From Swiss-Prot:
Pfam families: SnoaL_2. This is Steroid Delta-isomerase. It catalyses: a 3-oxo-Delta(5)-steroid = a 3-oxo-Delta(4)-steroid. Induction: By steroids. Changing V125A: Slightly reduces activity and reduces protein stability. GO terms for molecular function: steroid Delta-isomerase activity. Its EC number is 5.3.3.1. Homodimer. Changing D101N: Reduces activity 4-fold. Reduces activity 10000-fold.
Length: 125
């Protein structure tokens, strides 16, 4: 189980990978039986191929940017939460979404569960 400091690192690393848009690197951060709920409230997606397809859909557009908007909050049980902003292009319009990701890591330092909190109230132009 990642220490709190290690959770901070992994979670910041995740945002960095999203920001440069390395899909393969993002998918490698996940455990084989990981789940992704994004946005939280929608049914979880499971399976490495499914998670790759998710990130391909989301980031494969090319110009998606992401950055922490505050420090990573980390627990002593391998979990953490972080606020960030995603910038992307919607219908040729620049737009942004404010998100919080909650993650649990497994004993191998891999993401076991990802929950992304956001909705239309968090979307702007």
């Amino acid at each position: 189980l990642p220490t709190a400091q290690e959770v901070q690192g992994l979670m910041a690393r995740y945002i960095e990978l999203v920001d440069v848009g390395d899909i393969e690197a993002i998918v490698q951060m996940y455990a084989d039986d990981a789940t992704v709920e994004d946005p939280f409230g929608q049914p979880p997606i499971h399976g490495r191929e499914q998670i790759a397809a998710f990130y391909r859909q989301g980031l494969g557009g090319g110009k998606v940017r992401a950055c922490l908007t505050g420090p990573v909050r980390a627990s002593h049980n391998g979990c953490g939460a972080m606020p960030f902003r995603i910038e992307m292009v919607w219908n040729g319009q620049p737009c942004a979404v404010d998100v919080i990701d909650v993650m649990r890591f497994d004993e191998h330092g891999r993401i076991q569960t990802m929950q992304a909190y956001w909705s239309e109230v968090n979307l702007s132009v």
